[PDB]
Amino acid sequence: SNADLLETRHALEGIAAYYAALRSTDEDKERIRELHHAIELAQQSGDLDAESNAVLQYQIAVTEAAHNVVLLHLLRCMEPMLAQNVRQNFELLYSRREMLPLVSSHRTRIFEAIMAGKPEEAREASHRHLAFIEEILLDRSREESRRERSLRRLE
Amino acid sequence: SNADLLETRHALEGIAAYYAALRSTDEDKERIRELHHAIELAQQSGDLDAESNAVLQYQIAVTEAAHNVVLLHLLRCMEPMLAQNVRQNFELLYSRREMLPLVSSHRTRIFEAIMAGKPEEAREASHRHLAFIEEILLDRS
Numbered sequence: 591s592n593a594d595l596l597e598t599r600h601a602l603e604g605i606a607a608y609y610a611a612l613r614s615t616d617e618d619k620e621r622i623r624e625l626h627h628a629i630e631l632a633q634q635s636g637d638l639d640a641e642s643n644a645v646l647q648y649q650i651a652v653t654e655a656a657h658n659v660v661l662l663h664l665l666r667c668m669e670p671m672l673a674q675n676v677r678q679n680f681e682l683l684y685s686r687r688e689m690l691p692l693v694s695s696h697r698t699r700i701f702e703a704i705m706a707g708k709p710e711e712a713r714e715a716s717h718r719h720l721a722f723i724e725e726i727l728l729d730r731s732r733e734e735s736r737r738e739r740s741l742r743r744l745e
Numbered sequence: 746s747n748a749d750l751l752e753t754r755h756a757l758e759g760i761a762a763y764y765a766a767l768r769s770t771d772e773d774k775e776r777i778r779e780l781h782h783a784i785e786l787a788q789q790s791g792d793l794d795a796e797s798n799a800v801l802q803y804q805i806a807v808t809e810a811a812h813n814v815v816l817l818h819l820l821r822c823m824e825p826m827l828a829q830n831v832r833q834n835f836e837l838l839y840s841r842r843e844m845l846p847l848v849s850s851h852r853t854r855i856f857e858a859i860m861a862g863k864p865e866e867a868r869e870a871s872h873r874h875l876a877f878i879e880e881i882l883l884d885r886s
Contacts, residue, residue: 601756658749667822
């Protein structure tokens with residue numbers, strides 16, 4: 591399920607961000623800065639597949655920067671489904687382009703908390719980032735449900 | 746380490762218990778009851794390796810009973826390290842035998858919440874169960 595997977599990323603990306611904040615070296619923090627900025631460039635060029643891959647690579651670097659053997663192993667284990675989930679999320683976000691900045695905004699609060707070495711904040715930022723995506727997905731479902739329900743109820 | 750792994754189970758076993766409570770069939774709940782009782786028998790015989798395997802099998806059944814494809818995939822993925830973590834935890838618990846009953850006690854609140862079909866209680870029970878183990882590990886060194 592694409593639903594069950596989000597709840598799992600919710601859990602695992604939070605802890606990833608936590609340890610990344612606490613254990614990232616100076617080289618890690620720099621390699622992450624370039625990957626975070628790569629997301630912005632892909633978003634401004636308006637290329638969905640480019641931005642989707644930029645996010646996947648960012649999240650991998652964050653996980654490696656966490657230096658937690660089991661977490662990295664779990665990411666690699668689900669990497670194909672994760673890559674698919676991010677791609678699907680962005681297909682729905684590119685439908686409502688006004689949300690993209692707000693999503694990147696949430697993701698940037700995680701990045702900034704990692705660079706700053708604040709674990710608690712980084713984890714809470716990740717929860718809110720993914721929680722906010724779940725909310726956008728549910729609004730698509732809700733409005734498309736009203737769509738049919740309302741246009742059918744008129745007579 | 747043994748520490749990082751606990752935080753990972755903390756997360757994943759909570760969600761496992763949640764869905765197990767919500768989605769377990771009658772056959773699942775029964776297969777889990779036999780595995781839970783098997784832990785008690787292994788504990789009373791005082792056999793560490795037997796009780797360690799009983800817990801591993803219990804947790805697998807709980808995960809399967811959750812009917813959540815990604816969770817099961819993640820368990821299988823880390824199964825070797827998980828089996829090792831449980832075995833190591835019990836080596837430290839068998840050092841302070843007075844804790845064993847309290848650990849089984851916490852784990853039984855999860856089981857009971859699953860049989861009863863109460864997801865939020867089952868998840869909260871799992872957090873307290875593993876949180877309590879993390880505390881015992883930190884007191885060791």
